Amino acid sequence: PRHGRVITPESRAVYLYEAGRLDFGQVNELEGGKFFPATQSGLRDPDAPDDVANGMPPRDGEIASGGRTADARAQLNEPDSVAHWQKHAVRSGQSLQISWSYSMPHKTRRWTYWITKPGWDTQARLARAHFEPDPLKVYLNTYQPYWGPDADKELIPQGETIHEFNLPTRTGYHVLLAVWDVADTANAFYQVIDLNFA
């Protein structure tokens, strides 16, 4: 089993796990096509030409479950109007440390962090139109090709991945979408994090 999630601040799925509403596998398998916000499969990686081409990224309204809708992971896609997601109290400019944990981590091309626009329709199901077209932060692994002799050390996390950046200027409810792109598969892991800005 190949697993990844954002453990802190607790992702939406982690909070559902703590409430007994998702099991451990489910929280760690929000896996769909990489290269959000693209809406098509078969794209090559813009930085790494030998990387495996993407599968179909999650459609609008299925972003929070990573395109997973056959089981209780579907809960994740409910709008805040209905789910009243638990939201982390945050402030504009605040330094935020993100921690990923894993089981049997994949060879990784990048982690990307996307942020909702000021004025997004906060009561809707999540859609590409809600997110800033430019990522808040990207961490790109440069080692290529993914089958090169030093690939395991250069591309595979050996423990929790810890990222830190400053949140931008916002008020009210916002979503930070954290995405982990796998170099040698079609897929990425999708971890929505719910925020409440002073």
From TrEMBL:
Domain Chitin-binding type-4: 3-195
The UniProt record lists the keyword Mitochondrion: no
Top-level lineage group: Bacteria
Pfam family, one: LPMO_10
CDD domains per the UniProt record, alphabetical: LPMO_AA10
Keywords of the record: Signal
InterPro entries to which the protein is assigned, alphabetical: Cellulose/chitin-bd_N, GlcNAc_Chitin_IntDeg, Ig_E-set
Transmembrane segments: none
Official protein name in the record: Chitin binding domain
Record organism: Burkholderia pseudomallei (strain 1710b)
